[PDB]
Amino acid sequence: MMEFPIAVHKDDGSVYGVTVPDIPGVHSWGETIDDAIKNTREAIVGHVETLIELGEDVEFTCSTVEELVAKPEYAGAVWALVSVDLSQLDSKPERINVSIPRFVLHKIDAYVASRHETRSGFLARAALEALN
């Protein structure tokens, strides 16, 4: 699960505006903060899916709120985190047959059992993670 920090600003007349520190160029908005979060999620997912559909490598780096919160350009922002999982990206994953040593599977099984994760989800995230 990836967590994108998003910076929410609001004034008296204008609506909620949102910027995405890890994706300059994305600017979203909402009549309420909940709508702004949801609209920013859609903009982030559409961005990532679009670059994939274009044939581009996409490198999944997320900043943390901790590291951005004291920066002046984010003074007075309301911080939120939008959760993006890889299932949220590809609608038609491919089922493949692979062999994994049992001592590795036992470590995967112990780990995913406490997190509502699967062998498949763990391996897909591990595959992506090793590629960076």
Contact footprint for its own copies (CB under 8 A): 1, 3, 5, 31-34, 37-38, 41-42, 45-46, 49-50, 52-53, 57, 64-66, 69, 78-83, 86-87, 89-90, 92-111, 113-116, 119-120, 122-131
Interacting residue ranges for Cl ion, rule: CB under 5 A: 117-121
Cβ distance to its own copies smaller for residue 24 or 91? 91
Short-list 43, 52, 116, CA closest to 90: 52
Question: What is the per-residue burial (b if ≥16 Cβ within 10 Å, else e) of 54-68?
Answer: eeeeeeeeeeebeeb
Binding partner of residue 18 among Cl ion, its own copies, none, CB cut-off 5 to 8 Å per kind:
none
Calpha distance 78→36 (Å, rounded):
12
Cβ proximity of 37 and 28 under 8 Å: no
> Dihedral (C-alpha) 35, 41, 45, 50: value to the nearest 10 degrees?
60
Choose from its own copies, Cl ion, none: what does 61 bind? Cβ within 5-8 Å by kind.
Answer: none
Considering beta carbons, is residue 24 or 131 the nearer one to its own copies? 131
Closer residue to its own copies in complex, CB, 25/101: 101
